Structure formats: structure tokens, C-alpha cells
Structure 1
Amino acid sequence: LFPPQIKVAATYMRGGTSKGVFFRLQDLPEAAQVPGPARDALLLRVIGSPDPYAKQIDGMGGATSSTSETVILSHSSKANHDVDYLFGQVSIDKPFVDWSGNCGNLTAAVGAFAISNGLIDAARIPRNGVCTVRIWQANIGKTIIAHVPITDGAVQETGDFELDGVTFPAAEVQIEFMNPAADCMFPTGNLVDVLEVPGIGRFNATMINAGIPTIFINAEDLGYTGTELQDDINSDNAALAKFETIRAHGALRMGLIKHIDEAASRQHTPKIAFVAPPKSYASSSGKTVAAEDVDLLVRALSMGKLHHAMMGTAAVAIGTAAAIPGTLVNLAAGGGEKEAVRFGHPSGTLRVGAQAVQENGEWTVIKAIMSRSARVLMEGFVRVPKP
């Protein structure tokens, strides 16, 4: 006989409320330097998947969607970009890596990794200040900007900026998702649709493609209040099944898939989320989120479970939808023109800015913005058995 494990240079990082394994493209084994089965098999093995035990005890994964994540970065040859970014959502249970979406939380870590690993021109890095990293999000074909603080020519990781869902403070990293609307913001052409879901019921829904394709429904239409924590939903098999059926049909209605059964393998996109007007609740850390602290409540699912905080991509979808009068998100937030919203999720709150402009009946959004943070947890070499 059994050959030794191979070593692959890698960095394990927290970005926002997620953890991922990061690779320079050139550090991957040659076979994995192009998309396909060899790359996917390698990433699966690094993470510890597929795992019928659902624990990822034999890999780098943490057995949750927000800890079963891989990133491949390279210097970009594209005009006006520094770094090319591929995000792979590694299935816990299936031998599958999903490449259909971005990861918003890891974006801050992408910027930092790029700087620390020479993927941006040295001339673009100030000695002290803020380095603006232009990221080509290669999964979805979008520009994202990470403003990473620099001290003495190196990434400033540590700091006093707090994120709800991140245990310890770190340096603030401002992110900007440019032109988030898919090249349509509303695939159905409607702000709100009646989603026909065979076997479940009829649901008013806003389906938006900004940040990530997302289906928003009202909490009350599912018997929820919007203050739910993970334990209220993630042990409820019937409830989880209801959510998945809706997501599948939404995917079809959005024209993301050609047929309903594609949703079985395509778990990662679209996302499904429920919204509610402000209401006070204790977050997962025990801290009180007061109704006055937020504009609305949003809970989202990822890979079949209620997410512990909020996906960064879904935060973009929330901010963008809130800015367009008449979406379910906008209405949950009290209606009107909104240039930003702070929403309550299970771990606390998150503020996203998105200014929309109307001209000739159409709504456009130049960018959605939010702050995150990132830090290296471990750097060196991951090992897997010889492929």
C-alpha cells in the first residue's frame, strides 16, 4: 504493498461563519488541475466523503454544510481580475462535489489567501492599508471584491471586529458582490409567485437569482415564526422533507433544472429560506436579538438542514430582494425603498447593503455589500491515499 499517502499543500481557513480547505491550483496533483472525476475524488477524500456515518472523522470536514467546503484559487488571466475562485461544496453522503454556486462566507478568506500566496500582483498590495482584491467567481461568472487589511506588507488577520456566529473577533474584511443579478434577477419575471408544489400545497414565494438562486417563503405559511433555531427543525424529518420538495419545484419553476428529478443530485442550488417580520428571540449563543435590532428575520436551509447562521450568498439574495419593493423579503421588512437591511438569523444578526435603482420600470443593483472576517487555522500539507 500500500503506497504512502500523497501530500498536497493547503491552507485550512475560517472565512465568515464557515471553514474550508484552500488550494492553489498549481499545488494540486496534476490530474486534479483540470475539472472532472480526479479533482472531485481528491477533494472528496481530503474532506472525508462520502461518509455513511455522516461524521467526516476520516478527513478535514466537520460534517456540516458550512464545514464541508473546498476552494481552488489561481492567478487570473482575465482582464480586471486578480484571482480566479472555484468553490466546491463537498457532499457529506454522496461521492459528489457541487460546482454550481459561490460561497459568500469564504470570500474574505479568498482575498486573504490570494494576498498571502502571491496570486495578486505585488504592486497592488500596499505596505499598510487596504488591498482591494478583484475576484473572478468562476462558478457563477461574477466579480466580487474583497478589501483586505494589510500591515507591514502582510494580511492583517487579527482585530476587534465581531461577526454573529464567529466565536472570536478578527480584522474586518469588507466584501462587495458586483452586479449580483444573474445575467435574470427574477427568472419568472414576477416579484412574487404562487409556487405549486405537488403533494404539499400552494405557497407565495419570491424566487430571485442574486448571490445564489434563492426561494423565499413566509415563515407563517409553514407554521413557523422566524425565530426558530436548528434544534426546532433539524431533527424533524417530515419538516425537512417538506422544505426539500418545495426547493425542488422552485428550482424547476426558476428554470434551473429541466426536470424535477435533477434536484436529487443538485442539492446546493437553489437555496430555500423563510422570512418573517422582526420578533425578539434568544440566538444560538444565548444572546437576545431584540425585534428593534433587526428589519426582518430570515432562516435558510443548506444541503437539507437549517443553516446555523446565514450563507453569504443568501445574504446577498436577502439584501437584493429587500431593496426591491414588493418581494416577500421587502414586505417582511416593512416595505418601501431600502438601501440596506439587518436581518436576524439563528446566530444573531447580519447587515447587508444593496441599493436598487428603478428606471423604465426595471430594477437594477450595482452591488451588494457586507463585512466579514477571516483567519488561517492551519497551514501546511493535507494527506490522502495515493489516487
Structure 2
Amino acid sequence: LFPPQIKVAATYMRGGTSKGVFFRLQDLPEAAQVPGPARDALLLRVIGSPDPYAKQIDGMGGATSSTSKTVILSHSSKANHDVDYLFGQVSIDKPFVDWSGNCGNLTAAVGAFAISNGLIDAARIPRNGVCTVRIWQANIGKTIIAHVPITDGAVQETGDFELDGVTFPAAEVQIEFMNPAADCMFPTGNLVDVLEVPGIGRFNATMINAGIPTIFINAEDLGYTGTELQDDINSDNAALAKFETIRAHGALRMGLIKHIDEAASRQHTPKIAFVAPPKSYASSSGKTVAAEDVDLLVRALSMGKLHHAMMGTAAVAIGTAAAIPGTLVNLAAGGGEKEAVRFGHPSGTLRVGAQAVQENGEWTVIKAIMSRSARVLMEGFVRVPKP
């Protein structure tokens, strides 16, 4: 006996440079309406994981970190919030869904999905204009604001706003990551540190907890320039192994793990990235990024490979770190106080703003801001074999 597949109401969306499968909590099977193995098993099967072929041909996944993602949204019980946002990074190779972080790219899609699916107080949705969606990011306990355009009572998806890494234009969605610093911003208590990896090297690093726990290293310390593309790194097993050990040692120094061996099973956080001063390069689309077009270069890894553009959470970490004089990110951008930076990633450029202000002689960051876009790709029902 092999019962028919179940059907679960879902929407497949692009948010920024990421793709995800979005669910209303109430649309999930009863067993999956709370965190736990039942929920994880459903999401794993929807995506096509675990997959020893690493192709996700038997699911909704695209076999990359940017395309192996799930989102569960529900009404909020938090004061001054409209929607609760839970994000699951679905492992391609392991039966594991990681709930330890946010997805900054899908935030624009979160706002749109909430409006389109009855998760926002109707009084907050104008007939035309802007719907300000106040998102409670339930993974990290942070407020994120999405300013979603509205036309004729519906989300305005289409438009002429272009973002590097996104093939086609769409409507601009402004996002505000409120109070991004973990609440410490710098867990080591230092703006810069030296990560000692005995027998491998010594590496200047800034370790910051804002957007997502992130370790920034200088490109030159790795023999890189910061202009590298995926093909320069992602077939280099030695380089990948090196990034992973530095990430592990950074995780230990940040107090995110107690023993170095824990890093193997904790792949999603912290992120590791490398920075450099402005330099001209051809992006992955063949478009020239001039040194004059950027304040710095940043490349980041996700789930053990160089990311094709930039993770939204990592973009928050870049903006926040750039606003603090003396961080490796700030110094790559020429030092001094900074309200915003435009950085060069493999697919082009991204501008992120972060207002740092002194209070009691210490830096505080009110918010980090960026613009993304989002659109529905498919809507209806996903199917999996009966649980």
C-alpha cells in the first residue's frame, strides 16, 4: 500500500537573489504546525532533501544554498508587529533543517506574502500606496520592516527596479533591519582580532553579530584580491577546507561553539566572508564593476561554497561593520565614519546603509537598510508522499 501524495498550500517566490517555498502556518499539516521532526521531514521532502546526488531533482530545491529554503509565516502576537517569520535553511545533503538564522533576501517576499495571504491587519493595507509590514523575525528575535508597494489593494510585484544578481526588474521594496546588533555586536570585545589557526596561518578578522554572526577576513591574508568569482574558489577543495577551518576557529572565538568539532554540524552560522579595497572586475554576468563604483569588495561563503552574490543577512553585517570605525570592513572602505557603503560582490554591487550613533561613548546601530524586490513564481499546492 502506497497512499497518494498529500497536497500542502504553498507559494514559490523569489526574494532578492534567493528562492524559497513559503507556507502559512495554518496551511501545514497539524503535526507540522509546531517546530519538530514532523515539520522538518515535510520541509525536507518538499525541497528534495537529503539528496546524495546533490541535484534536488526530486523536490522544489535548486541544489544551491540560495535555492534550498523554506519559510513559515503566521499572525504575530508581538506588540507592534504584523507577521511572525520563521526561516529554515534546508541542507542539501543531510536530513537537517537549520533554524538558527534569518534570510535577509527573502524579507521582501515575506512582506508581500503576508499581505497577499491575509496575515496583515486589513486596516494597514491602503488601496494604493505603501503597506508597512512589521515583521517579527522569530529565528533571531528581531524587528524587520518591509515597505511593500500596493496597487488596487494588491501587492505591486512588477516595476523597473533593478538589482545586481536579479535577472529581471521588479518593484522596489525597502527593508529596514531594526537594532541589528545581537542583544553583543562584537562578541570578542574587539573591533579586530587575529585568528590563530596553528599550522595553517594567522588571520586578521572582524567578528560581528549583526544580521547574522559573521567573520570578516582580509582577502590578501588568503592570497585573494576580492575580485574572485565562484569558479575561482568553488572547485578548489583546499581553499574550501581552509575557509571552513577559519570559520570553525572564528565560531570558537565568538563563543558560538565550545569545541572545534561542533563546526561540522553547525554549517549555517557563523558566516565567513573576505574583504578588500575597491578594485575593478568583471562580474558573473560579464558587466564591468569599476573601482569607482564601489566603496569596497566583499565575497562571502554560505554552506561551504562562495555565494553567487551576497546573502541578505551578510549584507546587514557588512553595512553595520562599515559604520564602526576600525573594523576590517570599515578599513577596506577607507576608514572613518560611514552612513552607507556600496560593495562589490560576484554578481555586481549592493548598497547598504547603517546609521551608527554614539551613546555613553559607545556605538549603537539603530537600523540597517537596503532595497530588494520579490515576486511570486508559482502558487498552488506542493506535494509530498504521505507522512
For residues 288 and 116 of structure 1, what CA distance do their matches in structure 2 show?
A: 38
- Give the Å deviation of 1:261: 1.7
2:23 corresponds to: 23
2:360 corresponds to: 360
2:382 corresponds to: 382
**CA distances 1:245-302 after superposition (whole Å, capped 9, x unpaired):** 1111111110111221221111000000000000000000000000000000000000
- Give the Å deviation of 1:197: 1.7
For residues 173 and 214 of structure 2, what CA distance do their matches in structure 1 show?
A: 25
204-213 vs 357-366, greater mean Cα deviation: 357-366
- Give the Å deviation of 1:239: 0.3
**CA distances 1:55-110 after superposition (whole Å, capped 9, x unpaired):** 00000000000000000000101111100000000000000000000000000000
- Give the Å deviation of 1:348: 0.2
SS at 1:196's partner residue?
Answer: strand
- Give the Å deviation of 1:237: 0.3
Question: Matches of residues 300-339 of structure 1 in structure 2 within 5 Å?
Answer: 300-339=300-339
- Give the Å deviation of 1:130: 0.5
SS at 2:60's partner residue?
Answer: coil
**CA distances 1:173-229 after superposition (whole Å, capped 9, x unpaired):** 000000000000000000001112234211110000000000000000000000000
For residues 261 and 344 of structure 2, what CA distance do their matches in structure 1 show?
A: 33
So what's the TM-score if we normalise by structure 2? 0.99
For residues 151 and 259 of structure 2, what CA distance do their matches in structure 1 show?
A: 51
CA RMSD of aligned residues (A): 0.6
SS at 1:261's partner residue?
Answer: helix
For residues 2 and 327 of structure 1, what CA distance do their matches in structure 2 show?
A: 58
- Give the Å deviation of 1:355: 1.0
**CA distances 1:4-52 after superposition (whole Å, capped 9, x unpaired):** 0000000000000000000000100111111111111110000000000
- Give the Å deviation of 1:310: 0.2
- Give the Å deviation of 1:359: 2.9
Equivalent pairs, count: 387
SS at 1:12's partner residue?
Answer: strand
- Give the Å deviation of 1:360: 2.9
2:120 corresponds to: 120
For residues 42 and 126 of structure 1, what CA distance do their matches in structure 2 show?
A: 36
Runs of at least 4 residues off by over 3 Å = none
Identity %: 100
1:209 aligns with 2:209: yes
For residues 200 and 119 of structure 2, what CA distance do their matches in structure 1 show?
A: 49
Gaps spanning 5+ residues in structure 1: where? none
**CA distances 1:296-320 after superposition (whole Å, capped 9, x unpaired):** 0000000000000000000000000
For residues 72 and 258 of structure 1, what CA distance do their matches in structure 2 show?
A: 30
For residues 94 and 196 of structure 2, what CA distance do their matches in structure 1 show?
A: 29
So what's the TM-score if we normalise by structure 1? 0.99
Gaps spanning 5+ residues in structure 2: where? none
For residues 82 and 110 of structure 2, what CA distance do their matches in structure 1 show?
A: 11
**CA distances 1:149-176 after superposition (whole Å, capped 9, x unpaired):** 0000000000000010000000000000
SS at 2:221's partner residue?
Answer: helix
For residues 6 and 359 of structure 1, what CA distance do their matches in structure 2 show?
A: 55
For residues 262 and 96 of structure 2, what CA distance do their matches in structure 1 show?
A: 14
**CA distances 1:102-122 after superposition (whole Å, capped 9, x unpaired):** 000000000000000000100
